[PDB]
Subunit: 400 residues, 4 copies
Amino acid sequence: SHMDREFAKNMGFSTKAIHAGNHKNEFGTLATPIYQTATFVFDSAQQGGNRFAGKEEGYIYTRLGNPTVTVLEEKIAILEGGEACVATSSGMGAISSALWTALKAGDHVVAADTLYGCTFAYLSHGLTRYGVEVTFVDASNPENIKEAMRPNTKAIYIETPANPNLKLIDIKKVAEIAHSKEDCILIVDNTFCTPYIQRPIELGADVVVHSATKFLNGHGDVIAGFVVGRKSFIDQVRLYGIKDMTGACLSPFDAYLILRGLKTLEIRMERHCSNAMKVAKFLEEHKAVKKVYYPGLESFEQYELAKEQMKLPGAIIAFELNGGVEEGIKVLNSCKVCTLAVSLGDAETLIQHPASMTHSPYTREERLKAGISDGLIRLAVGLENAEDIIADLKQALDAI
Amino acid sequence: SHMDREFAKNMGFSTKAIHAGNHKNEFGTLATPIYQTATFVFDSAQQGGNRFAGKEEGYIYTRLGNPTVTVLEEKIAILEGGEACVATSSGMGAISSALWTALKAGDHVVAADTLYGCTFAYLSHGLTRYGVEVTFVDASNPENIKEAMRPNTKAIYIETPANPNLKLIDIKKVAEIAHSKEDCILIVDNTFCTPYIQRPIELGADVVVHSATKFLNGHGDVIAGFVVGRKSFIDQVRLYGIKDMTGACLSPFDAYLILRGLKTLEIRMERHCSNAMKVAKFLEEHKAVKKVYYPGLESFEQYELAKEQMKLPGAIIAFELNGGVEEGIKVLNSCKVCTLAVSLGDAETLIQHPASMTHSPYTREERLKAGISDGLIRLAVGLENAEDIIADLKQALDAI
Amino acid sequence: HMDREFAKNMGFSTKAIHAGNHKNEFGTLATPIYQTATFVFDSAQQGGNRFAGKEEGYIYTRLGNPTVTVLEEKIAILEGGEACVATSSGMGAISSALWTALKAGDHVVAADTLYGCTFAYLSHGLTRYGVEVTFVDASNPENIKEAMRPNTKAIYIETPANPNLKLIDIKKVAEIAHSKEDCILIVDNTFCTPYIQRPIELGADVVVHSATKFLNGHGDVIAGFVVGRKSFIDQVRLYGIKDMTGACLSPFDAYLILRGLKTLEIRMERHCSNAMKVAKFLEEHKAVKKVYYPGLESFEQYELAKEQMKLPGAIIAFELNGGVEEGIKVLNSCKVCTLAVSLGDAETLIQHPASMTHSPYTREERLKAGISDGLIRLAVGLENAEDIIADLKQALDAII
Amino acid sequence: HMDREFAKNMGFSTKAIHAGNHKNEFGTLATPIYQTATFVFDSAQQGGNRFAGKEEGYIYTRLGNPTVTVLEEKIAILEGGEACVATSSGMGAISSALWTALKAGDHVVAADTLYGCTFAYLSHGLTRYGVEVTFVDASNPENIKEAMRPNTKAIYIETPANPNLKLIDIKKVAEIAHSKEDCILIVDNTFCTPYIQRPIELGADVVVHSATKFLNGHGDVIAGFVVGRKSFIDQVRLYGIKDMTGACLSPFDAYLILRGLKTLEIRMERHCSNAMKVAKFLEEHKAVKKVYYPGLESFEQYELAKEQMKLPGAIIAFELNGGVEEGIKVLNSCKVCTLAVSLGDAETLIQHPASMTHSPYTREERLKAGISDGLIRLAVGLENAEDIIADLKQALDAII
Ligand SMILES: CCCC[C@H](N)C(=O)O
Ligand SMILES: CCCC[C@H](N)C(=O)O
Ligand SMILES: CCCC[C@H](N)C(=O)O
Ligand SMILES: CCCC[C@H](N)C(=O)O
């Protein structure tokens, strides 16, 4: 490293996203080199053995660690305010590696009712198949978590804003509940916010997981994830969760593209939220739109909590139309600028129907209990000029 | 696809490794394009829903599937003689995703006593922590597997040659034992051999796992894996093991580099084994070397089985010196051509001490039971001229 | 996907993301990296038709590649030109265009203040091949008209241009170039980008760029572009690049420029926002003798900067109240500003030509070229302006 | 890691893997991809010293890059030259070397049979810039000596060369070039590679390559090299590439060539092994009128092929007992041989110049250039020779 985290404390977010974690190499390359290698050479046989026993620093194998990935891990941990970070080949790889490491057969988990489709599948149809009981509750009211707590509850998993409806959860209050019992941790999926908007570790969370694929990469060309938290737990996830349980190690090439994307994280998040506030206001005033969910609108139920724990309201807008699923299909198909695709946190504005697409693993009974309407549309607002996004949505909504 | 697997049946190995699985795209690029994307665009909202319900072919998200990865999966399945394949971000990702999918709490596994370090850790300290009993046996004698079989044994995991000592296991006889019980499968780790040398599916295995990092990539710059088997099981590993349990999805860039490496798989394996037969004979005749384990030497215990199930003897040579660990260190450090590093299946000849390096998770009690000597040296013979590899080893061994 | 006619009414950011992009058979959101050398023909007739220019399609990457085509169409749409052709460097674009447009016996009227290597290519390159070149102070357009000759086939200008960032009225120079029948105006729009300045609309025939700088924006690709009429761009593609220079761009590098262009509007806005703040600070600072920046009211050509540039840019040249020793002290004292050549990157780059670039030059030679003892060129990055200003203050306060 | 002196006694494969490689601070086995545009100086003095050539180090990727340096040293070691400089294309290497070595008023004696674009660069390029070029039948060296003039500063040759793969005795032409004081011999060693032919040892001053072909070997990188004395290579780096052409190679493309070179010996051996088998088959086949291949005893310059080439190469030109229509039928009938231009790839490429490359040319123009109605150039790949021969047999049997 060149910029120490002590020097980085007084620096701004954009400055840290560019210079923090970066290492001054022998050639002095401005860009972090792509150390696209599988194995590393030891100077002596004794060095190799010391490296395996944790007695000497250095690299051994890319699944264990790589210098391109180290710069990215150090950079993410500095922004989130965590001791250490470990990158994975996907957002689900980060979620699974952390939960496989922190849990064992006989443990209990209190998870939020509204979660990302595959996360719900991993908890309901994955961890339950391996002798781990999971209780899903409406996390908006923290008292439901307190009620579902048990003497064997070793972890609490939350996601705020919840994908897709954007239901918020007070992190600081849930951390107080998690820390009431001796052996219990709070895992927060900070994919939607990024450390620019929200930092759950500072609010009380022990572990923070991300789907780097979305806003941290920002260019929709890398499937990746991160696990941020205390060094003691991150070393366990690196040498057990990824090394043995999942095998979800990130490629040095993909890690370089995330480093490249992070250089513009502050300016991308500012434009993303600037456009989303303008699009959400337009949707709220439009006749064809029945209800708009966005933390920036005064009509949002948890508007006071959005101001308290989020720097900006985000880029995602969930909304319901004055019509069934047929009306929603007509809007999606009429779009010429808004791209009809899955995923979020990209320069292209993406749009989709969560009932049949993202939250498809959820059965219709579980879907409606969480709050997914047959006709809800989730909009991931991109970096295009808000004038063109609004014009495209207007010509599509005016037809219905 | 351009070359159908019916046309590919009569073609040779090198021809299949170059043309099989390749798709003729709209531009007609000779090289497979690197579709470095995270999400894919649907032509209509109905198309998206049909794609998620499995009613229409096409792509949705790179974690689920990608066209660069599809060409590689089709190519590997054709060479191995399997119905389908699914790529992962690491060799351990392929092992874990297949075992997480095939097993549940209450199941039993009969695993080989000599296995790769992290595989042993995933079975002994991973699956056991999640209510799955595992019995390790000397798989060289198949009767030990038959004795360890139980009414709940849903899988048998084997690796032949076993890393590092190179102990062989008759696949056809173990498959007959696995198929005696209704719900039991045989998983074979064909990393060392590759489908050019050994094809366990044809011998009887249900599932074949690989660590693409080693000989299939061949250039030591990609950490990757594969799960080959019946389409029914491969779809379950793709949409459950990788999608939810591990998150070990392969990057399209890394997948392209494996496709690039496969173009020379036949010529690399031939040179690798050509040099290894010459190095092993030299080591056997050298005074300082006590015992050499290599399937090509007539001194090998399972020499008849090596001829029956392997096309060539491979590139790995395990050997013991007429001296302790100090003598082995002196040999490793004296090397100028043989690179002192971990991993195998690369142009550079790699050399290491398994006791302190690869099989370090094994405790000294478990290590000696499997057959790992304090002083054993595993040599991954590269593609350099055998004259220079032998000359380098001679000047190092003559000093002791 | 998005036709040039539909893109006309769209904003800059929207065009930089969606214009030029092609909807492929798989529907990848990101443009695929067609990393290939040659392309396959469906029949022998198809190959012949493509070589005769009768049928559309690809033949070889040096001639053309689909990743590069998307980038070329995108750049031509933003600049308002008919066609574009990418090169492996900024100098490759400059040389390929001039080698194509000129022959032995022709004359060129070039600006006196140009990029170091451009001046070398004109003074030592084209003169060595029977091409006379007259260098003039292009700020006053009357000097260009005086240096015009009956054989002047081209006029090369760069605005702004080092050392003091002087400007050239493009519309006035185009009127001079078009007074003679066979004469063109080539403008190096590297500093401005089509977001700030579009010389084709003002009158220029050809526009060259060094994509390495602001168009890529991440300092990891050496690349260039030649924009102009299709008739001349086809000649540069099939003669200048194909035969004279061989400066063809890699599809991988082309993809990274496409990735960088997704945030061009937001990067240029932040770059100029920070530069206006840094320039005002430097002007008010005691240790700074003079500041050259098109945004300050003290700038000589302030009216022309507002007339032909949307924003004043990101480059700031400034004189110190001190010699070469003071300039060395300031640069070495920097802890945020990076000591490196080049411009248009997230990292703020700082250079002192007297002690770094023009160091072989003697003091007499330096002053003839226009490099003073305390001249410092600053390429303002995307970090928070408060941290850039704080770093410059602690360095400049030491020399008071 | 491996010095040029230690590499002297090592074999070709060993040098192609270990020579030129640099032991970096992390000890990565694979050469890192230093994908950067600019490099950071530790002090203002360091930057100045590097610009004055007094201190070693990097400044900008167009000038030099560490990934490219490892590749340049590796190529120069194999060719037996003092220094090498990489370019973004084969034509970039040819043009940069000729632009550097020549000036207006100089004369060049070039071979009559050369690569299409090389002939265009000499006949239409250099002649347009006051450089006279005389083309002669280089098979008889007396024609070169007759075309020599007091201003002949260079002689350009290519051996073997299309259409009929004619050879040129390098050692005899070097004696002619060195008879005059200021004259050099440039040899295009694309077809042979330093494994088959090393023109510097035979007498050549400069050796140019199109790395796209056999050195890369995987048909995914357009690149070139200029090998020769350090004095001339420094001039080509800091004048030919830096200013005249701008043909600098990308670090990513340079890495892929390094990856491809790891298997150069084994690829060239298989390429020539298959080509000798295919050429013998074609010679004995009834529908084939004549076969040009340096390995057949029917070859005119068979003694010279054994004298200056280790192996006869992978390219086979052959005449059919039929016109253009028969040649079209044969190519369209192929199911394994790929219809594409270029050479030196795992896929066997087949081309019929009469109906594909020289299709704009009329029949009278085709015969003057040397392209007959039934001439077919075949770049033999790495597939099994039995499948290549079987594919050619079913295509040639249809035209009997
Ligand atoms: C099911 C994979 C696609 C889901 C996507 N990650 C989203 O949340 O939009
Ligand atoms: C522990 C990671 C390195 C082990 C390496 N995969 C080998 O088998 O040699
Ligand atoms: C080769 C000199 C590099 C100078 C650098 N391109 C600049 O903009 O200052
Ligand atoms: C631009 C023409 C391409 C021809 C190709 N390089 C060949 O070797 O035939």
